């Protein structure tokens, strides 16, 4: 039996980056040569492993994480990066071994008038630890006075929408990302 990579790469909808999905992949043979040879990927960067010389290996567990981000945010899906996405949404470890795969999905995830389904966390007190997922929606307190769930001055809703529109610039367009880490 093959690995369910089509179930991940060709999934109908992707998750918001803040609520990124993780697919546990075990007990299957995978053909990563079929993956790399697909010229339909904008980003295919591997860390700690050569991309082509990957088919003949043996790892205990493989994780396929996937989400949507902006074009200009794809560079943040890499070890030792800083920024909104890497600090507050999806963090890779510094000693990451695995691959980051991405491709433009403007014709799937952007809608006229804005697709407000995809979100990202704008506010968080501390940075995420590697492979941490924060899905809370509590009002972010930015001053001394507590918020008690009322948005206002110094009281900010933590998630914001990308509003993907087909006429966006490439840097603001939606990109689908698949992060393969090898245990």
């Amino acid at each position: 039996n093959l690995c369910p990579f089509g179930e991940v790469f060709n999934a109908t909808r992707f998750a918001s980056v803040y609520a990124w999905n993780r697919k546990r992949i075990s007990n299957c043979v995978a053909d990563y040569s079929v993956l790399y040879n697909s010229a339909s990927f904008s980003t295919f960067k591997c860390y700690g492993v050569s991309p082509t010389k990957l088919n003949d290996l043996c790892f205990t567990n493989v994780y396929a994480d996937s989400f949507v981000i902006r074009g200009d945010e794809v560079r943040q899906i890499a070890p030792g990066q800083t920024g909104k996405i890497a600090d507050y949404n999806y963090k890779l470890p510094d000693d990451f071994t695995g691959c980051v795969i991405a491709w433009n999905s403007n014709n799937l995830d952007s809608k006229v008038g804005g697709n407000y389904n995809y979100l990202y966390r704008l506010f968080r007190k501390s940075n995420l630890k590697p492979f941490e997922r924060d899905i809370s929606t509590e009002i972010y307190q930015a001053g001394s006075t507590p918020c008690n769930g009322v948005e206002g001055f110094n009281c900010y809703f933590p998630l914001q929408s990308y509003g993907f529109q087909p006429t966006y610039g490439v840097g603001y367009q939606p990109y689908r990302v698949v992060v393969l880490s090898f245990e």
Partner: antibody, heavy 117, light 108 residues
């Protein structure tokens, strides 16, 4: 109530160092996107540096490796260490709070930095 | 990405309908803010997210646009509205961009 008060501006020769401070009240520095913005006499606004609530720091290319942003949580202050100061660094320096993707609602009064030999 | 601001200088009278334009070299949706600045003062936030009026700013100010063409509109200019006005590109860390500015002076 809510305000940011700058201090530390002054006269300095090229290659010297200066340290700016931003004493905040009505907002918590380390819970906010805090930024430094400068304006040369008669010129426009130029963003200088930001520090995230999470600790990440970023800098405009014209100050990278010379300026260092930081904060003191016990005194609720924002700072800017300016090294290797050049004549073109002459400006009024504002600290501001970014509450939505770069929108600065609270600004300091500004402090003047003059770099001349 | 670069921001141009038109016109550079503008002469208006008390009670006029003033429109200021900001142009972005790429489609940035609603990620724009507008500031007013008077000589020797810090900027003052007027609009953010292209059209949201910042609290405490008079209602005669409004912003509109999306993509590349943005406008700041003062529907009935008042004597304290004679100032300079700047647009800003939002969601552009690590390099925010400010427009060159528009100076509005008293027509005579």
């Amino acid at each position: 109530q809510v305000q940011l008060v700058e201090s530390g501006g002054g006269l300095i020769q090229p290659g010297g160092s200066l340290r700016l401070s931003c004493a905040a009240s009505g907002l918590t520095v380390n819970r906010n996107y805090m930024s430094w913005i400068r304006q040369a006499p008669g010129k426009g606004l130029e963003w200088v540096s930001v520090i995230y609530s999470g600790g990440s720091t970023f800098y405009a290319d014209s100050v990278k490796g010379r300026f260092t942003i930081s904060r003191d949580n016990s005194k609720n202050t924002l700072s800017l260490q300016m090294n290797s100061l050049r004549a073109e660094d002459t400006a009024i320096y504002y600290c501001a709070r970014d509450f939505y993707e770069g929108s600065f609602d609270i600004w300091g009064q500004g402090t003047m930095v003059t770099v001349s030999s | 990405i670069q921001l141009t601001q038109s016109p550079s200088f503008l002469s208006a009278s008390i009670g006029d309908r003033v429109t200021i334009t900001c142009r972005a070299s790429q489609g940035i949706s609603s990620y724009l803010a507008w500031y007013q600045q008077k000589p020797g003062k810090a900027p003052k936030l007027l609009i953010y997210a292209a059209s949201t009026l910042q609290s405490g700013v008079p209602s005669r100010f409004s912003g509109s646009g999306s993509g590349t063409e943005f406008t700041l509109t003062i529907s009935s200019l008042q004597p304290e509205d004679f100032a300079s006005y700047y647009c800003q590109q939002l969601n552009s860390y690590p390099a925010p961009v400010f427009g060159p500015g528009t100076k509005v002076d008293i027509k005579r």
